Design an enzyme around this catalytic site. Structure first.
Site, PDB file in Angstrom:
ATOM      1  N   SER A 157       0.813  -1.214   0.000  1.00 40.38           N
ATOM      2  CA  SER A 157       0.000   0.000   0.000  1.00 40.38           C
ATOM      3  C   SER A 157       0.836   1.248   0.000  1.00 40.38           C
ATOM      4  O   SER A 157       0.388   2.281  -0.500  1.00 40.38           O
ATOM      5  CB  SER A 157      -0.903   0.081   1.220  1.00 40.38           C
ATOM      6  OG  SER A 157      -1.830  -0.959   1.228  1.00 40.38           O
ATOM      7  N   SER A 166      -0.751   5.927  -6.775  1.00 34.73           N
ATOM      8  CA  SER A 166       0.616   6.207  -6.347  1.00 34.73           C
ATOM      9  C   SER A 166       1.453   6.829  -7.450  1.00 34.73           C
ATOM     10  O   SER A 166       2.482   7.453  -7.163  1.00 34.73           O
ATOM     11  CB  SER A 166       1.298   4.928  -5.869  1.00 34.73           C
ATOM     12  OG  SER A 166       1.620   4.095  -6.977  1.00 34.73           O
ATOM     13  N   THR A 202      -4.158  -1.461  -3.881  1.00 27.33           N
ATOM     14  CA  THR A 202      -4.571  -0.152  -3.383  1.00 27.33           C
ATOM     15  C   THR A 202      -3.898   1.000  -4.122  1.00 27.33           C
ATOM     16  O   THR A 202      -4.488   2.080  -4.291  1.00 27.33           O
ATOM     17  CB  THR A 202      -4.270  -0.086  -1.896  1.00 27.33           C
ATOM     18  OG1 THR A 202      -5.513  -0.216  -1.195  1.00 27.33           O
ATOM     19  CG2 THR A 202      -3.511   1.222  -1.507  1.00 27.33           C
ATOM     20  N   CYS A 203      -2.661   0.802  -4.565  1.00 25.52           N
ATOM     21  CA  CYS A 203      -1.966   1.923  -5.166  1.00 25.52           C
ATOM     22  C   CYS A 203      -2.528   2.252  -6.535  1.00 25.52           C
ATOM     23  O   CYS A 203      -2.495   3.415  -6.943  1.00 25.52           O
ATOM     24  CB  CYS A 203      -0.481   1.635  -5.218  1.00 25.52           C
ATOM     25  SG  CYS A 203       0.160   1.659  -3.562  1.00 25.52           S
ATOM     26  N   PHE A 204      -3.086   1.270  -7.239  1.00 25.88           N
ATOM     27  CA  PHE A 204      -3.675   1.524  -8.546  1.00 25.88           C
ATOM     28  C   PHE A 204      -5.197   1.519  -8.518  1.00 25.88           C
ATOM     29  O   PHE A 204      -5.824   1.489  -9.581  1.00 25.88           O
ATOM     30  CB  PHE A 204      -3.148   0.515  -9.567  1.00 25.88           C
ATOM     31  CG  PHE A 204      -1.678   0.292  -9.459  1.00 25.88           C
ATOM     32  CD1 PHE A 204      -0.787   1.278  -9.868  1.00 25.88           C
ATOM     33  CD2 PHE A 204      -1.178  -0.876  -8.937  1.00 25.88           C
ATOM     34  CE1 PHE A 204       0.591   1.097  -9.765  1.00 25.88           C
ATOM     35  CE2 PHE A 204       0.181  -1.070  -8.828  1.00 25.88           C
ATOM     36  CZ  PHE A 204       1.074  -0.076  -9.249  1.00 25.88           C
TER      37      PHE A 204
END
Length: 531
Positions: A313, A478, A500-502
């Site tokens: 994350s 991100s 979560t980052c994408f």
């Protein structure tokens, strides 16, 4: 050979020595001040911030629609006998309590929960027929055996739901049971809110923050909304770059984290204490904030352990680095890693004497161990302690015991009604089309469910309950802009993953709406870990 090749000071900036011969800097322009030598880079962060923290005029109007949560006493029955079974309501008459069973239209004078209050962490519930069962939030189990009488009813038992309403109503109560009288006066000017708010709060003993909050803004009302307002602005105000307190993991304002360089600011610990008492105060007085920490930060607050998928994350390129070393031979590949890290530049030893231990296959897992720990706590340990202690003296962390990280974030942040149209227009499909059965079902699920599970679904995928300020069209990842994206993976025997980052929900192609609703709901409710 190049001892110093740094940038010069941008014109309008003077280096200074203070009364004790430390070095500070003065933006002669903005008539402001920082401990950290400016670059022409960091000013555009400050400018990225001044644009945020000036244009938040109308951020307020939504952020009060956010005051959906739980109609406090109007919807918080932490009665110690517990609830009435279905179809039963309580009543009174000649000051005498009668019980009506609308389920049947009989009427007793005996409470149907037959007297011995049940242990810390347990909640009674009933069933769509009527049978009493017990929910153990100390282990997220449900037996049918009463914790007191070892008793039961024939058995065919029940799956665990989380009871947030009930875990919250017990928190509200714990907070009002420790509230002191009089008030605490917080007096701040808008032009200096922070410096102002810092000095006051940091001059009070912790107990005084538990008296009523009387915030007033010099030159301007209702005491309640000013408290909402204070917390709103001050939440954005500590994020301000010149203070050196927090940085960000990804580009723009993605993945907020304690900056390990905050130590350039000689008072940074006192600010993390200040920021800490500030978040506690918001919880204790039932006011939202909007600063937005990452979910693994809330996990450290709960003092749950930080797993390797939490690492995905906060540093997607570092986590891939570790997974690769974990699933591939590293004698095959020509590199030469040791049990140390280069990070400001100083080599810190993951283990005693790490810096001269080669990472072999024999110990690459122990390496990935220490590596994950270090990543989560590189250089921000005091900063963290400072914050947690500052928190803890105002709300003891133990009161958070039965909350998971994704609940602790709804208690601080708000809970707005999600715009379902904006979500589905601004969603992109990898290996699906808008005509795919799993995709049609997914939005049928989303319309059919309720707002609390929508919030958790959003927490599961993107990592936060806060809808971004400009619609789902502006949702960020991100690497900057990254719309909510649903992607076909695996066969129907898998489980939903999240990236979560994408803002990517990995969603296997389930053969039915019923299976999809099920397999998915389980994933968004699942919280691993124990504190």
């Amino acid at each position: 050979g190049s001892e110093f090749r740094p940038q010069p000071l941008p014109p309008g900036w003077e280096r200074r020595v203070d009364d004790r011969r430390r070095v500070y800097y003065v933006d002669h322009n903005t008539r402001t001040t920082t401990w950290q030598r400016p670059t022409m880079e960091s000013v555009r962060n400050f400018e990225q911030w001044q644009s945020q923290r000036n244009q938040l005029q109308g951020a307020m109007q939504q952020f009060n629609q956010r005051y959906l949560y739980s109609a406090s006493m109007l919807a918080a029955e932490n009665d110690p006998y517990g609830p009435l079974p279905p179809g039963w309501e309580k009543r009174v008459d000649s000051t005498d309590r009668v019980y009506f069973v609308n389920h049947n239209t009989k009427t007793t004078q005996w409470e149907d929960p037959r007297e011995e209050p049940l242990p810390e962490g347990w909640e009674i519930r009933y069933t769509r027929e009527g049978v009493r069962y017990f929910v153990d939030h100390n282990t997220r189990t449900t037996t049918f055996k009463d914790p007191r009488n070892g008793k039961s009813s024939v058995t065919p038992q029940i799956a665990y739901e989380r009871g947030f309403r009930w875990k919250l109503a017990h928190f509200r109560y714990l907070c009002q049971s420790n509230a002191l009288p009089s008030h605490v006066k917080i007096n701040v000017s808008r032009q200096t809110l922070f410096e102002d708010s810092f000095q006051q709060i940091m001059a009070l003993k912790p107990y005084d923050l538990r008296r009523r909050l009387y915030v007033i803004f010099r030159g301007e009302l209702d005491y309640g909304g000013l408290a909402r307002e204070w917390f709103f602005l001050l939440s954005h105000e500590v994020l301000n770059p010149m203070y050196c307190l927090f940085e960000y993991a990804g580009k723009n304002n993605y993945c907020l984290q304690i900056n390990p360089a905050s130590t350039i600011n000689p008072d940074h610990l006192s600010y993390f204490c200040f920021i800490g008492r500030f978040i506690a105060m918001a919880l204790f007085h039932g006011k939202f904030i909007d600063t937005g920490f990452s979910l693994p930060f809330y996990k450290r607050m709960l003092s749950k352990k930080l797993t390797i998928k939490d690492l995905e994350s906060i540093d997607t390129e570092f986590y891939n680095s570790l997974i690769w070393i974990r699933d591939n031979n590293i004698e095959e590949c020509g590199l030469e890693m040791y049990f140390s890290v280069d990070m400001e530049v100083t080599s810190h030893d993951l283990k005693l004497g790490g810096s001269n231990i080669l990472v072999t296959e024999e110990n690459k897992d122990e390496y990935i161990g220490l590596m994950t720990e270090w990543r989560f706590s590189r250089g921000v340990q005091e900063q963290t302690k400072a914050f947690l202690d500052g928190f803890n003296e105002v709300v003891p962390l133990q009161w958070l015991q039965y909350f998971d990280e994704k609940e602790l974030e709804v208690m601080l942040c708000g809970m707005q009604e999600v715009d379902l149209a904006d979500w589905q227009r601004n969603t992109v499909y990898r290996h699906y089309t808008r005509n795919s059965k799993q995709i049609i079902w997914f939005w049928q699920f989303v319309k059919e469910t309720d707002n609390e599970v929508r919030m958790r679904l959003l927490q599961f995928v993107t990592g936060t309950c806060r809808l971004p300020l400009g619609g789902f069209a502006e949702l960020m990842g991100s690497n900057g802009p990254q719309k909510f994206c649903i992607e076909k993976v695996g066969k129907d025997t898998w489980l939903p993953r999240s990236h979560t980052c994408f803002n990517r929900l990995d969603l296997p192609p389930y053969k039915s709406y019923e299976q999809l609703k099920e397999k998915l709901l389980f994933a968004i409710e699942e919280t691993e870990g124990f504190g």
